[PDB]
Design a protein around this ligand. Structure first.
Ligand SMILES: CCN1CCN(c2ccccc2CO)CC1
Length: 209
């Protein structure tokens, strides 16, 4: 049972702007997704400060980067607070309508695409490198759900019958054919060191056979 939703008009515009604008500094997508994961981990940590049982679904607070050349995917896993179904539908927990409005007003005022994270819609920079994005997520108060979109104005939401996560969010980027450099270890390492050197959680870059 798959439900299909239309993006709000402003978010569909933001996505086609990211997909069609010529912009060479595509590596900022990883900084934005790691920063989103750090925010989600800060949230479950703060909640656990007054209620330790919120960590019953997993005490470790971390971020994993998993490249897979066979599937042409780069996956960013965090054990943060996760997202409910309502959150997923509501633009993955962001204020994406007013965020897009401020971002686009800033673009015409001298900003560039790399500043997207300052307007709360950094997740969508995933479409700088990915043709399709799958988000698997588990919040303590809800079941495990899968969100998916290849842009084009719509996304789907379904109950995820896959591997149980415990708690957190998994962003799977199905990379464009000419963006496979972001599957190479030394390239990911260079980008993490350049843009995410001070993240307060351990970032583990997995290797392949
Ligand atoms: C402001 C609300 N936050 C909700 C959680 N976030 C998020 C969004 C998209 C994918 C993955 C994650 C977390 O890993 C960051 C934004």
């Amino acid at each position: 049972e798959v439900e299909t939703f239309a993006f709000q008009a402003e978010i569909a515009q933001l996505m086609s702007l990211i997909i069609n604008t010529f912009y060479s500094n595509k590596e900022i997508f990883l900084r934005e997704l790691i920063s989103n994961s750090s925010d989600a981990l800060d949230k479950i940590r703060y909640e656990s400060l007054t209620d330790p049982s919120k960590l019953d679904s997993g005490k470790e607070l971390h971020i994993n980067l998993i490249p897979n050349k066979q599937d042409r995917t780069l996956t960013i896993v965090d054990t943060g607070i996760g997202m409910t179904k309502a959150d997923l539908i509501n633009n993955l927990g962001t204020i994406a309508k007013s965020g897009t409005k401020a971002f686009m007003e800033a673009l015409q005022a001298g900003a560039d695409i790399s500043m997207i994270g300052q307007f709360g819609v950094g997740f969508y920079s995933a479409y700088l490198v990915a043709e399709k994005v799958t988000v698997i997520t588990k919040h303590n108060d809800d079941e495990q759900y899968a969100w998916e979109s290849s842009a084009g104005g719509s996304f789907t939401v379904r109950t995820d019958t896959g591997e149980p996560m415990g708690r957190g969010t998994k962003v799977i980027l199905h990379l464009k054919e000419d963006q496979t450099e972001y599957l190479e270890e030394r390239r990911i390492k260079e980008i993490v060191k350049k843009h995410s050197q001070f993240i307060g959680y351990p970032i583990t870059l997995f290797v392949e056979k």
